[PDB]
């Protein structure tokens, strides 16, 4: 296969993580980006990163192109999909990382201008088909617009895949302890709701997520069986899924941990891993696994009532899945 | 009743919170403290607090006495209970806030020197009787040495009391998102185990707690039915209990929230309250309630599988219970 | 005097601090506010504050009015000064706390609609007269539009007043270690320049300030003699001025500290104080002094080369000066 | 030259940074360490680092040896220099990183047991000769016990070298904005003085440093001409020197920046660099330069009164100098 050619719409945390990941691999090539910023600021943000460290390599411009380690990348700056002829620079797949385009209606214009496939970097706001690697990726039907779901779906999903396949999930509730993100306020200031208005680096902030209820999209046998919620805490990156569930049969802790290690070695290779070293959140910064189960934190009480704790780099793991998904569907 | 006279052994976060709470009430009087610090540093730490703000009032010394708003308080500085004649300064109850004395054997010397009652500010390391206000305080038998359990027991306990009395708990697992505390490291440095060695203000740190399994001490019907664990996050104070449980019957969200509001108004007055305002952690700094249930975060799936989220000021709520317990047993 | 009636345009950190300060005093009355938020969010942000704690008292609405402890306050929600008939609700002075209106041209519409006086909550972007209490407030000429300068001017200004009056300033450079503020990013994301794009709670961020060069506006004898700069650090509130200067004559540390204590007791009463207790930043949260000189940090080398360190609550001290200035010019 | 063989006494932040730096170079070899920890915790802390990331490579034990990428390193665990036969494992130089041994008297026992040279990882508490690379390293006389001074000396020193050589320093005062370190408290708790007792991740904390006054040890022409102080802020690593000085003649900003760039390219190659990219603190995590002058922050007022801002990774820059110094004196 020729390396699939892709464009990135939206050069934020996910956009720039995706770009770095594409530049480390030989089976995918970045030809264009779009962000509503001047080129001096694009270069600076790409080169220097508080979380993932300095990009090793030259980051130059000339004058509508990023030049990264000598390779030219076209840079657009328009809010309007009309002005983004990504296909004209060779793009086969657009990675949609703006947060602005989460319906087929708003992504169809890319296809109409000659892009073959669009992948949303977030849950769809309509009935756009949703795919998650290792969970329902085997069912892909060649659709030209898909959702890759959320960072949380790409941790919780693989965990559920293993539990459902080995044991059976009767019901479950999930909390995520989640790193703060953009569109949380630095100081108490107006936002879309009360709790999101409060200072993110000095509070525990309850925040809603549809990630659990929406598992029906990628595992329909879990329709009506899972819900959950989030607690935003003062870390800049890395999060955990805390899944509490009732399984269809009696299990032990060891049996659960062994099922995860067996998937880590086979069907979820590269996607789920198991931590036997007692790491903390910062150890998973720039980790490409979507789920890291902390084996020592696995609990079972009264035969069938379990807790599983899985880390995810909400930036780097999800970005790693977006890039895997572009390579998979090409 | 004459105001019960008490001494505080250990003038740390709990010791100093307890002292401030005693100085705001007329039914308890502080006569002595002990801490292995010089008197200049005792005054400074008591007067200024990063979390709970400046003490309003005069904080002076003369020269073995704190003088707080004109009232003289004896200050000892010895690690050894032998040198602490608290009873000689009128103390009826010792609040044991050192972390050093969590067995009847190590507290008996206080009784032997004329103290009437000792209350441990932590779970006992032996079979010392444990009491929690609103949970099993009605069963107190006049024992002269007791444990008031942990900050977590004084949030989770009252929550369980309500769930058990209205609905029946079949089984449950708990996560606490907990503020960092003393004897967590500022930077990666050796501690009693791996995870406790890691920088507390820049990581999510899984940490063990016996608080759930130990609920059998205060609610024996929950023997073998609860376990749980902790995630230390970068907040200086205030924590949450996240309880996931299977109840003995079908319930709704509204029914659970109404049971909490009914206890808040009756048997758990002053102990449990319900938040209907969508507060965040910093809103509960210096809150005297041991449990604040966030009503909007209450979840039920598949009839009987529930999640309840309750805040607690791990410093001020527990300290408020220690002071209530001293007044109650006097 | 009747209590001067004021309106607040812009209900952010400064707007809400100003409002709380007005509600604690009997010589000024708040009749109206404006902020582009729904009334539910206005109430929540006013009631709960991560930094300054819960407002003690009832915060209700009915339905275009905040009702605070029973007193009705009109709430507008328009970006356009055209729609803000503050004078119709009795306002004599508008406190301009939006950041949007820092020229006489943009504030004249308030006067044209019957407001007597406007005070900008920031340095003017034109030649609008600037006044700072204790510095050049004695020179006020009855102007109907003024600037109260910046939080930094209201710390550095009073410090310079004392140094200039006792000793003579030949030249000086200033660094401020400054709390993060709104319009700093939570995560690395595009902003008006490179450094402002970087995560505020995980970096030391050099940031420009005109506060030193602009001292000529309030002390013309310092024209061309001072410049300085800022380092934003991860604290939510409270900052320091670090002034390094060459004085016109030889001085000692004691002589400098005594000059500050003498101004604290006389001409800068309520404005500058001296800390002899070795406090840290969080001790000055909700402090109404514009400058708190840390006496133990005062340095002199080689006769005439000095350093002075002064704290300021960048929110509460400046807000306290805005309210003092409204009362002073009424 | 054979690669000089060294041992590390004290495996904390400096000890472990030094070890990682030694394992990346071919001109120095690590044969032994000492730390009062069990071997499981030594491995974990070496392998995982909140600040500098995961060690790339195998970290094993057998059973009194770290095995790092296949190479055996002896591990002692004794507080007493008596039990540390580093020379028996081939060590020529001991890097003294405990903080416990800062006099010739306390380091002489190493020489007496066959070590050729000891380097203190901190300023000496006696008249032990002090050397700093690029500053007075050319004057080394073969002394077998030296101090490498402090992290701050290894930033401020090189900056002064350039200013003194090009312009002449008449006098100067310095502030450092410094990352928190071990032996600062996580929560308000007793420490050696008042300010060090206060919570390090939620305050700006004034802290004393002898680094400026002590410049006379490495540049005697600066005897009595410099003093300074520190402000600890909530960052886990990386600090800045803010030097304010009066030079012997008139200079411009450009002239100062050009003098630094010229030293960066010649006599201070590898030691001082100049930032022309507007980086923030986290960009210098794991930076080996002892001084990074931020060229855009250089200020001059009234001919001869200057400010210079220089970053340093207080861990990695100093550690890089310790390793350079061991190679230089071998
Ligand atoms: N943990 C995570 O961060 C994470 C993980 C997985 C999924 N996601 C999802 O990924 C998406 C991006 O999140 P993020 O964290 O990368 O946010 P971000 O850092 O704010 O990135 C979004 C970027 O898109 C730009 N943008 C917005 N609308 C645009 C438009 N119409 N045309 C062009 N550029 C536009 C933004 O500029 P402006 O700021 O000026 O609007 C910004 O640079 C969202 O859908 C988010 O939910 C986030
Ligand atoms: N969230 C909370 O903080 C919280 C809540 C509920 C329960 N607790 C429990 O309350 C107790 C105290 O916790 P804390 O957070 O207040 O800790 P802390 O701030 O470290 O306070 C403990 C204090 O006791 C002193 N001390 C220790 N051993 C002593 C002895 N033998 N004699 C005299 N003084 C002694 C310590 O001095 P040294 O530092 O020199 O040893 C320190 O000042 C522990 O049992 C803890 O588990 C904590
Ligand atoms: N340390 C400090 O915070 C400090 C100290 C002294 C001086 N100041 C100055 O005080 C002013 C406010 O600062 P702040 O920290 O309070 O910022 P803030 O919290 O962002 O407050 C500004 C508020 O004004 C609103 N607003 C903006 N433009 C408006 C308009 N045209 N009409 C109505 N409302 C409008 C904003 O809504 P939107 O967010 O939607 O625009 C926001 O609620 C600035 O001039 C600032 O430089 C700040
Ligand atoms: N920014 C920086 O961190 C920095 C920069 C330059 C210079 N330094 C200097 O470098 C030295 C170490 O600082 P650090 O930050 O690495 O501190 P650290 O992380 O606390 O490391 C010190 C280590 O030495 C151990 N230790 C102490 N006394 C010992 C003894 N007698 N024998 C054996 N091991 C002993 C400690 O164990 P215990 O904790 O049990 O005592 C700890 O592991 C100090 O002199 C410091 O001032 C620090
Ligand atoms: Na590539
Ligand atoms: Na927020
Ligand atoms: Na009392
Ligand atoms: Na820790
Ligand atoms: Na009033
Ligand atoms: Na910023
Ligand atoms: Na080596
Ligand atoms: Na400290």
How far, in Å, is the centroid of ligand 10 from the Cα of C121? 22
Check if C125 contacts B (Cβ < 8 Å). Answer: no
Task: Give CA A224 to chain center in angstroms.
Answer: 23
Q: Which of A17, A151, A160, A287 is an active site residue?
A: A151
Ligand 2 binding pocket includes B25 (Cβ within 6 Å): no
> Which residue of C176, C231, C277, C304 to mutate against D (max D Cβ within 10 Å)?
C231
**At which residue do the structure tokens 């910064």 appear?**
A285
- Minimum-distance ligand 2 atom for the alpha carbon of B154: 6
Burial of C27 (0-12, 13-18, 19+ CB in 10 A): middle
CA angle (C232, A283, D286) in 5-degree steps: 50
d(CA C273, CA B184): 36
- The CA distance from C263 to the nearest CA of chain D, in Å, is 24
List CB contacts (< 8 A) between B278 and chain C: 44
Residue pair B78/B311 in contact by the 8 Å Cβ criterion:
no
Would you call D177 and C173 a contact, using CB atoms and an 8 Å cutoff?
Answer: no
CA–CA distance, D251 with A105 (Å, rounded to integer):
63
B233 has a chain C CB within 8 A of its CB: no
Strand partners, D316: none
CA distance B210 to chain C (A): 31
Give the single-character DSSP code of A196: G
Q: Decide: C317 and C154 in contact? Cβ < 8 Å.
A: yes
Mutate one of A53, A238, A280, A296 to test the D interface: name it (highest D CB count within 10 A).
Answer: A53
Q: Whose CA is nearest to atom 15 of ligand 4?
A: D13
Mark yes or no for CB contact C53/B53 under 8 Å. yes
Q: Atom 21 of ligand 3 has which residue's CA nearest to it? A: C12
What residues of C are designated binding site for NADP(+)? 13-14, 35, 79, 121, 182, 190
Of the candidates C105, C103, C98, C57, the one whose C-alpha atom is nearest the C-alpha of residue C76 is C98
Which residue is it, tokens 């007005």? C22
Q: How was this structure determined?
A: X-ray
Based on the residue annotation, tell me whether B151 is a catalytic residue of this protein.
yes
Helix ranges, C101-183 (H): 104-112, 153-166
Question: Coil, strand, or helix at residue D74?
Answer: strand
B50 contacts in chain C (CB < 8 Å): 280, 282
Interface of D with A in 253-282 (CB under 8 A): 277-280, 282
Distances (CA, A) of B227 to A256, B198, B215, B243, B294: 17, 25, 9, 10, 22
How far apart CA B108 and CA B144 sit, in angstroms, is 9
C296 touches B: beta carbon within 8 Å: no
Contact B226 A281 (CB under 8 A): no
> What is the rounded CA–CA span in Å between residue D326 and residue A107?
61
Which burial class, exposed, middle or buried, applies to C285 when counting CB atoms under 10 A from its CB (0-12, 13-18, 19+)? buried
Euclidean distance between CA atoms A69 and A23, whole angstroms:
9
- Tell me which chains share at least 3 CB pairs under 8 Å with chain A: B, C, D
Q: Which residue has the tokens 């010397």?
A: B109
Nearby residues of A198 by Cβ (< 8 Å), 6 or more positions away: A185, A188, A205, B280, B282, C48, C50
Q: How far apart are CA D174 and CA C309, in angstroms?
A: 12
3-state secondary structure of B292: strand
DSSP conformation letters of D276-305 = -S---GGGGTT---SEEEEGGG-EEETTTE
D56 burial level (CB within 10 Å; 0-12, 13-18, 19+): exposed
Report yes or no: A185 at the C interface, CB cutoff 8 Å: yes
Residue C73 C-alpha to ligand 9 middle, in angstroms? Answer: 11
When CB atoms are compared, the residue of C48, C182, C190 closest to A189 is: C182
Give first-to-last CA distance, chain D, whole Å: 10
**What are the start-end ranges of the E strands in C133-247?**
145-147, 169-178, 205-207, 226-232, 239-247
B–D: how many Cβ contacts below 8 A? 96
How many Å apart are CA B135 and CA A155, to the nearest integer? 38
Displacement of CA A260 from its chain's centroid (Å): 20
CA B132 to chain centre: 10
CA angle C109, C111, C113 (to 5 degrees): 70
CB-ligand 2 contact for B148 (6 Å cutoff): no
Q: How far is CA A153 from CA A179, A229, B70, D24, in A?
A: 15, 12, 61, 39
> For this experimental structure, what is the resolution in angstroms?
2.2
Binding-face residues of B in 134-163 toward C, CB within 8 A: none
Using CB atoms within 10 Å of the CB of residue C168, give its burial: 0 to 12 exposed, 13 to 18 middle, 19+ buried. Answer: middle
Query: Which of B57, B80, B113 shows the shortest CA–CA distance to B9?
Result: B80
Cα dist. B228→A278, A280, B132, B243, B299 in Å?
17, 18, 19, 9, 18
Which atom of ligand 3 lies nearest, measured to the CA of C14? 16
D138, with CB counted inside 10 A (0-12, 13-18, 19+), is exposed
Q: Is C47 helix (H, G, I), strand (E, B) or coil?
A: helix
State if residue C237 touches ligand 3 by the CB under 6 angstroms criterion. no
Contact A279 D48 (CB under 8 A): yes
Nearest CA in chain D to C169: D302
The whole-angstrom separation of Cα B29 and Cα B1 is 12
Question: Which domains, and CATH codes, for chain B?
Answer: 4-150+319-329 (3.40.50.720), 151-318 (3.30.360.10)
How many CA atoms lie within 13 Å of B46's alpha carbon, on the beta-carbon side?
29
What is the DSSP track for D232-248?
E-S-SS-EEEEEEEEES
How many other CB atoms sit within 10 Å of the CB of residue A141?
7
Give the span between the Cα atoms of D199 and D226, in whole angstroms: 30
Q: What is the dihedral of CA C19, C22, C23, C29, to 10 degrees?
A: -110
- Residue D201 in contact with partner chain B when CB distance is under 8 A: yes
Question: Distance from the CA of D250 to the center of ligand 7, in angstroms?
Answer: 66
Positive or negative, the Cα torsion across A129, A133, A135, A137? positive
Pocket test for ligand 1, best of A13, A183, A286 (most atoms within 8 A of CB): A13
């Amino acid at each position: 296969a020729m390396a699939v050619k892709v464009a990135i719409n939206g050069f934020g945390r996910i956009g720039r993580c995706v770009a770095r990941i594409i530049l480390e691999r030989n089976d995918i090539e970045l030809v264009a980006i779009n962000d509503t910023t001047d080129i001096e600021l694009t270069k600076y943000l790409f080169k220097y990163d508080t979380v993932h460290g300095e990009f090793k390599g030259s980051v130059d411009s000339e004058g509508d192109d990023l030049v990264v380690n000598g390779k030219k990348i076209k840079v657009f700056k328009s809010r309007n999909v009309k002005d983004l002829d990504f296909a004209k620079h060779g793009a086969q797949i657009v990675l949609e990382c703006t947060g602005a385009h989460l319906t087929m209606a708003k992504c169809q214009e890319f296809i109409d201008m000659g892009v073959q496939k669009v992948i949303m970097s977030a849950p769809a706001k309509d009935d756009t088909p949703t795919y998650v690697l290792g969970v329902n990726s085997e069912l892909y039907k060649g659709e030209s617009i898909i959702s890759n779901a959320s960072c949380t779906t790409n941790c919780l999903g693989p965990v559920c895949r293993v539990l459902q396949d080995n044991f059976g999930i009767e019901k479950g509730l999930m909390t995520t302890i989640h790193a703060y993100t953009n569109g949380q306020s630095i100081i108490d200031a107006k936002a879309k709701d009360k709790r999101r208005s409060r200072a993110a680096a000095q509070n525990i902030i309850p925040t809603s997520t549809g990630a659990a209820k929406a598992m029906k999209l990628v595992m329909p046998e879990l329709n009506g069986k899972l819900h959950g919620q989030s607690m935003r805490v003062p870390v800049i990156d890395v999060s955990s899924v805390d899944l509490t569930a009732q399984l269809s049969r009696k299990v032990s802790k060891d049996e659960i941990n062994e099922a995860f290690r067996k998937a880590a070695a086979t069907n979820l290779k590269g996607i789920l891993m198991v931590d036997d070293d007692e790491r903390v959140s910062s150890d998973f910064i720039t980790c490409s696994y979507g789920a890291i189960v902390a084996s020592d934190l696995t609990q079972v009480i009264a035969d069938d009532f379990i807790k599983v704790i899985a880390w995810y780099d909400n930036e780097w793991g999800y970005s790693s899945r977006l890039v895997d998904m572009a390579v998979y569907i090409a």
